[PDB]
Design a protein around this ligand. Structure first.
Ligand SMILES: O=C1NC(=O)/C(=C/c2cccc(Br)c2)N1
Ligand code: NA
Length: 456
């Protein structure tokens, strides 16, 4: 048995996130430093309004993906790590999942760093003392302790951060535009003086940004509110109501702040708003500086935990269920996380983001296909928590699914500027014949699937 209280399906009465609340999580989750860099650097290849469009477009494809990748977790309260067990093996899933937990972990050390930079700036603008690594750990530590309260803290922190972040940001735009003596419409076309990058690969850079979160949303959305006695058509509006809520959370948030990153770049030559606003205004008081840094901290806190730390936690406590618990998995993930020292990664994000999509594109495709197409949403919780059952395949690993991943990865390379969308679609489509083959050796359903509601 692989079950323990932390890695267990989430009972109907334990669910706490409705559609408005999930939006309140996503709005604050989209407000984060890294989108300044991406959308800023985008101004090299396109002008600001197009970048906003590449953001809105990229935000929207992510949501279309969320609608499908979230549907099993909402209905059945299960993990990401647990859910991968279906098409890949019970252990074979560890292969893509280790790929993915690493990614998740990479973002965690990056943002803890940005957070640390902020806190270190606040202090040295007071105490002149400027030690960063201590502030790194301390922040890593602070996130861990606030992550202990799982989605409960997250949900309360993001609803209050959201408007504050929203206001600090609208203010930010005012300060720039004003202090530069420029209208909104004027800045909107000042960019794009070095074309070459396809607009498709632009959209693909923002899609490739959230793909880790989108693919493994489970760990967030297994907490959303569901009515067990709906129907096919009431379940679909429910999925859609949640999917709609994520759109209204991440789009307007990442459009306003994407715009700020782009604006910074285009007005002053730097993606970092500290610099762009400081110059344009010609210095700022120590208070109003500290503010900005409180923002970065508030903006890092609203994104890092929920998006980067939750999912390796659940990966640990659910693979080694007697060794790790959620809280203990959080401690081990944040330590490993910081010991990856991701702040030394050579390059820029865009190409990395272009990497992230085409690396997990087939993974999202194989999971959507297994659950929706092959099995028709008809799953067995019982077998997901047991070493030997209908998800054990060949001695714990489903090599055919690992085969479909490779093949689909290959085909993905045949369309470099659309890598992600071909690899997903390829994996999606190939899983079907591959699974209709495996079904001749192994069963796709189980009698024990009637105990599903016992868990809930
Ligand atoms: O999965 C993710 N964890 C992160 O921290 C993260 C950052 C990010 C997301 C979208 C666009 C951009 Br630009 C950056 N993604
Ligand atoms: Na945030």
């Amino acid at each position: 048995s692989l079950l323990n209280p932390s890695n267990a399906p989430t009972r109907y009465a334990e669910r706490s996130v409705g559609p408005f609340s999930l939006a309140a999580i996503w709005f604050a989750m989209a407000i984060q430093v890294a989108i300044f860099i991406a959308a800023g650097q985008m101004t090299s290849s396109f002008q600001v309004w197009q970048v906003i469009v590449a953001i809105a477009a990229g935000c929207t494809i992510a949501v279309i993906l969320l609608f499908f990748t979230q549907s099993a977790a909402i209905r059945w309260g299960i993990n990401f790590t647990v859910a991968a067990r279906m098409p890949f093996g019970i252990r074979g899933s560890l292969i893509p999942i280790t790929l993915k937990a690493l990614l998740s972990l990479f973002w965690f050390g990056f943002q803890t760093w940005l957070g640390a930079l902020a806190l270190d700036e606040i202090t040295r603008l007071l105490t002149g003392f400027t030690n960063l690594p201590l502030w790194i750990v301390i922040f890593g530590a602070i996130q861990v302790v606030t992550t202990f309260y799982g989605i409960t803290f997250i949900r309360w922190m993001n609803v209050f951060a959201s408007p504050v972040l929203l206001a600090m940001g609208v203010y930010m735009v005012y300060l720039m535009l004003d202090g530069a003596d420029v209208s909104l419409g004027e800045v909107m076309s000042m960019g794009g003086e070095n074309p070459g990058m396809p607009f498709s690969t632009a959209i693909m850079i923002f899609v490739g940004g959230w793909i880790a979160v989108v693919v493994s949303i489970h760990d967030i959305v297994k907490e959303c509110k569901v009515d067990p006695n709906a129907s096919r058509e009431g379940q679909t509006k429910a999925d859609a109501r949640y999917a709609t809520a994520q759109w209204l959370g991440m789009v307007p948030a990442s459009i306003i702040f994407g715009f700020i990153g782009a604006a910074s770049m285009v007005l002053v030559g730097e993606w970092n708003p500290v610099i762009a606003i400081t110059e344009v205004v010609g210095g700022v008081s120590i208070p109003m500086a500290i503010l900005f840094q409180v923002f970065v901290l508030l903006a890092t806190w609203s994104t890092n935990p929920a998006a980067n730390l939750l999912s390796p936690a659940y990966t640990l406590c659910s693979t080694f269920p007697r060794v790790f618990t959620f809280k203990t998995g959080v401690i081990v993930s944040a330590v490993v996380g910081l010991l990856m020292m991701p702040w030394q990664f050579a390059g820029v994000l865009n190409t990395f983001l272009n990497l992230l999509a085409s690396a997990l594109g087939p993974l999202a495709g194989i999971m959507i296909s297994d659950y929706f197409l092959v099995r028709r949403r008809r799953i067995s919780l019982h077998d997901l928590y047991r070493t030997k059952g209908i998800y054990t395949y060949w001695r714990g690993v489903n090599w055919v699914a690992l085969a479909v991943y490779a093949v689909a990865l290959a085909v993905s390379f045949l369309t470099p500027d659309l890598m992600f969308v071909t690899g997903l679609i390829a994996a999606l489509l190939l899983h079907i014949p591959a699974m209709r083959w495996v079904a001749k050796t192994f069963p796709l359903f189980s009698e024990a699937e009637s105990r599903n509601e016992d868990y809930l």
